[PDB]
Amino acid sequence: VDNQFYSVEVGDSTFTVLKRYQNLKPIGSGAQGIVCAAYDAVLDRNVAIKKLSRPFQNQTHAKRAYRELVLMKCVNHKNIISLLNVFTPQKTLEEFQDVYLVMELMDANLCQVIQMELDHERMSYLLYQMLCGIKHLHSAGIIHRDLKPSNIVVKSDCTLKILDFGLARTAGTSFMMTPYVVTRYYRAPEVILGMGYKENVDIWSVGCIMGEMVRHKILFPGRDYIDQWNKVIEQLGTPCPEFMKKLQPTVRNYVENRPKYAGLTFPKLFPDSLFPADSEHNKLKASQARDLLSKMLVIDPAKRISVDDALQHPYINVWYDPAEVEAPPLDEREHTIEEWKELIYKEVMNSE
Numbered sequence: 001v002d003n004q005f006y007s008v009e010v011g012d013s014t015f016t017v018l019k020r021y022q023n024l025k026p027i028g029s030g031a032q033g034i035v036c037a038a039y040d041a042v043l044d045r046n047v048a049i050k051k052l053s054r055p056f057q058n059q060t061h062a063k064r065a066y067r068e069l070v071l072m073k074c075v076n077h078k079n080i081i082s083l084l085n086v087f088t089p090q091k092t093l094e095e096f097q098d099v100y101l102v103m104e105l106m107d108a109n110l111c112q113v114i115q116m117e118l119d120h121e122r123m124s125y126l127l128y129q130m131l132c133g134i135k136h137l138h139s140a141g142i143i144h145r146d147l148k149p150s151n152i153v154v155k156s157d158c159t160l161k162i163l164d165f166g167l168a169r170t171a172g173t174s175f176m177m178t179p180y181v182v183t184r185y186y187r188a189p190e191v192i193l194g195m196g197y198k199e200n201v202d203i204w205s206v207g208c209i210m211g212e213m214v215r216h217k218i219l220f221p222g223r224d225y226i227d228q229w230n231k232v233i234e235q236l237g238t239p240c241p242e243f244m245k246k247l248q249p250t251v252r253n254y255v256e257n258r259p260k261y262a263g264l265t266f267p268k269l270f271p272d273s274l275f276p277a278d279s280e281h282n283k284l285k286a287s288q289a290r291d292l293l294s295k296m297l298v299i300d301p302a303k304r305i306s307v308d309d310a311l312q313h314p315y316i317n318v319w320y321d322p323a324e325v326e327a328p329p330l331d332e333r334e335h336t337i338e339e340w341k342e343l344i345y346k347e348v349m350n351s352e
């Protein structure tokens with residue numbers, strides 16, 4: 001029963017895990033949960049273990065935790081999180097407290113990668129894999145809308161996985177008591193301005209990541225959506241009247257009433273100084289990288305490149321492989337914390 005489990009203090013937290021998981025060491029502790037590295041003695045491989053403490057404790061944690069468990073079963077792709085295991089040490093719904101998630105151990109997140117100079121081979125391979133993952137989600141009917149470096153992980157061999165499935169179709173009120181601050185620098189204008197969106201909402205986030213890889217700074221920092229919008233228009237320019245007409249008349253009022261900005265060309269935004277461009281190879285790849293940035297970092301989604309088109313772009317297309325690109329492949333729920341506990345328990349136990 002519970003002799004299948006042991007308890008060890010990993011930093012501040014107590015981890016109670018199956019005895020197959022050995023030599024726990026803390027990686028991360030924050031909003032989602034606490035993560036540790038372990039050796040899995042049954043599979044003879046290194047794994048990451050994420051602890052969710054009482055994920056049913058409010059409707060935000062609860063909706064996220066449930067969505068993640070369910071959506072895992074709708075995705076089969078090497079660039080998206082796969083679970084090796086999920087378990088709870090508690091034996092009844094009454095006692096049920098914690099869910100543990102187990103997956104392949106990765107070496108770093110894309111935050112650490114951004115702090116490094118990458119050659120064009122590594123940058124384009126990372127972007128290629130991000131797009132493969134996003135296409136897989138899109139073909140499953142999942143539009144992410146919150147892709148960001150901290151939820152993307154890599155191995156030393158430059159292989160990449162996306163860890164999370166983004167925002168609810170309808171989220172509504174996401175209030176929580178915490179110092180845990182959500183990072184929104186990578187969210188599309190559609191998201192920021194509460195517009196309609198389609199698949200290429202996620203192309204804006206890839207743009208913000210690719211731009212950050214090149215600049216080694218956040219493109220669009222800011223305390224809040226106001227700051228963020230200002231940083232967007234200062235660099236890309238005020239968007240055309242055409243785009244304003246698609247805004248709610250009240251956001252439209254705010255946006256159309258900001259100071260106008262001409263906006264900078266992509267050469268200015270991403271000068272030659274930032275690029276590997278010594279050899280003829282690297283000069284050409286430098287212009288192709290800028291060309292792709294200029295098509296992804298477009299405010300109007302009707303003018304922004306699609307996933308399928310980004311995969312056909314010469315900067316990316318050198319990696320193109322039908323098997324990875326054309327690999328074949330809930331949100332409307334509002335519950336009390338009592339009902340969520342049950343829904344999550346049934347999914348962990350696999351009761352239904």
Ligand SMILES: CSc1nc(-c2ccc(F)cc2)c(-c2ccnc(Nc3ccc4c(c3)CCc3cc(NC(=O)CCCN(C)C)ccc3/N=N\4)c2)n1C
Nearest residue numbers: 027028035048049050101102103104105106107108109151
């Ligand atoms: C969104 S947060 C998250 N959730 C999961 C997850 C895990 C299991 C699941 F089933 C599902 C999800 C993961 C995950 C999944 C698979 N592998 C990993 N690996 C891993 C290995 C190294 C590493 C990181 C992550 C993240 C960053 C990291 C954190 C730390 N902690 C420190 O405090 C470092 C230095 C502190 N110093 C300033 C004093 C030290 C090394 C660090 N550098 N790189 C992490 N992540 C990070």
